[PDB]
Amino acid sequence: FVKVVKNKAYFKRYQVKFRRRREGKTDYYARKRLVIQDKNKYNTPKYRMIVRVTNRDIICQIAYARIEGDMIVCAAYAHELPKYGVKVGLTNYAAAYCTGLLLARRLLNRFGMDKIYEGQVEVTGDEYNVESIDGQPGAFTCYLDAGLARTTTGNKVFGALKGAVDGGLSIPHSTKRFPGYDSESKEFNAEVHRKHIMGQNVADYMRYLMEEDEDAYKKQFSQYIKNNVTPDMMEEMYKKAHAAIRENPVYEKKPKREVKKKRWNRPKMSLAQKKDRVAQKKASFLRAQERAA
């Protein structure tokens, strides 16, 4: 046979990795470079923009590191958009730009920096940077926290980032990864980025499926027909959605209703039962052994 690999000695020596590494959720090689502060700053917080993409949502949080666990200062989700103006398609590139805008505007409104630091109202898609204003409070600064997502050109972690810098945050970045940076000749094209921010690439997919095949269109964009989103109102939808965020980005928590205090979960067993299950098991073995003999 073979020498058993996972033997008793193998477990006696085994050293597990960190919990958030055992699940594939944190890059501690990159987290260490992201969240720690230089020691001559002394609790000067290092804010980072935690942008996370899921299957059906986009989570954009801002946080600074703390020894008891890094603390969320402000958050925003994708599913907060149907409140404002975005019915369906809450995971595309245009959804990310909204959530980054909704995060940025909500934060400065919480720091009283709404009336200053407007940012980029008319969305263009080129390099914008909010320089601080003298006398007035300095601009907020944070860093992107990509995570385990491969940061290729056009990745939606850069889409929400664009929504934030237009909101007024001074996030250091560049235009190498935006959707519209030419790879071969190495220059940016602001017009092409404007398309994806306003969702035009989806319209040119839905307009592509009018002359090609309706069946796949009635299967690819099902909720888009359920909400009547034709390729004609898409740019003016997000453009309206951008205004409806820059005028009231406050969050309103749902009412915490009184719970009925029950249990779906399964409760753990006491020792007295475990020690008596085996006493029933052992008894039921021998009493079934005397029958057949």
By CB under 7 A, the residues from 89 to 148 that bind RNA are: 89, 91-94, 111-113, 137-141, 143-148
Q: Build a one-symbol-per-residue string for 22-61: x at contacts with another protein by CB under 8 A, - elsewhere.
A: ------xx-xx--xxxxxx-xx------------------
How many chain residues bind RNA (CB under 7 A)? 135
Q: Please report, as residue ranges, which positions from 71 to 130 form the binding site for another protein (by CB under 8 A).
A: none
Using CB under 8 A as the binding rule, whether residue 10 contacts another protein is answered as: no
Single-letter amino acid, residue 283: A
Using CB under 7 A as the binding rule, whether residue 285 contacts RNA is answered as: no
Three-state SS for 59?
strand
Using CB under 8 A as the binding rule, whether residue 15 contacts another protein is answered as: yes
Smallest gap from Cβ 244 to RNA, in A, equals 19
Q: Which two tokens stand for residue 162?
A: 């664009």
Using CB under 8 A as the binding rule, whether residue 192 contacts another protein is answered as: no
Using CB under 7 A as the binding rule, whether residue 186 contacts RNA is answered as: no
Given RNA, another protein, none, residue 285, with its beta carbon under 5 to 8 Å by kind, binds: another protein
Of 291, 25, 14, 249, which is closest to residue 148 (Cα–Cα)? 25
Q: Please report, as residue ranges, which positions from 19 to 38 form the binding site for RNA (by CB under 7 A).
A: 19-31, 33-35, 38
Using CB under 8 A as the binding rule, whether residue 5 contacts another protein is answered as: no
Smallest gap from Cβ 84 to RNA, in A, equals 15
Using CB under 7 A as the binding rule, whether residue 222 contacts RNA is answered as: yes
Strands annotated E in the chain: 47-53, 58-64, 71-77, 143-145
Using CB under 8 A as the binding rule, whether residue 19 contacts another protein is answered as: no
For another protein, the closer of residues 183 and 289 by Cβ is: 289
Rounded to whole angstroms, what are the CA distances from 115 to 107, 111, 140, 160, 168?
12, 10, 14, 22, 11
DSSP-derived secondary structure for 60-103: EEEEE--TTS-EEEEEEESTTHHHHT--S-TTSHHHHHHHHHHH
The whole-angstrom separation of Cα 94 and Cα 196 is: 6
Three-state SS for 47?
strand
Q: Please report, as residue ranges, which positions from 252 to 291 form the binding site for another protein (by CB under 8 A).
A: 278, 281-282, 285-286, 289
Rounded to whole angstroms, what are the CA distances from 125 to 76, 143, 190, 274?
22, 20, 5, 65
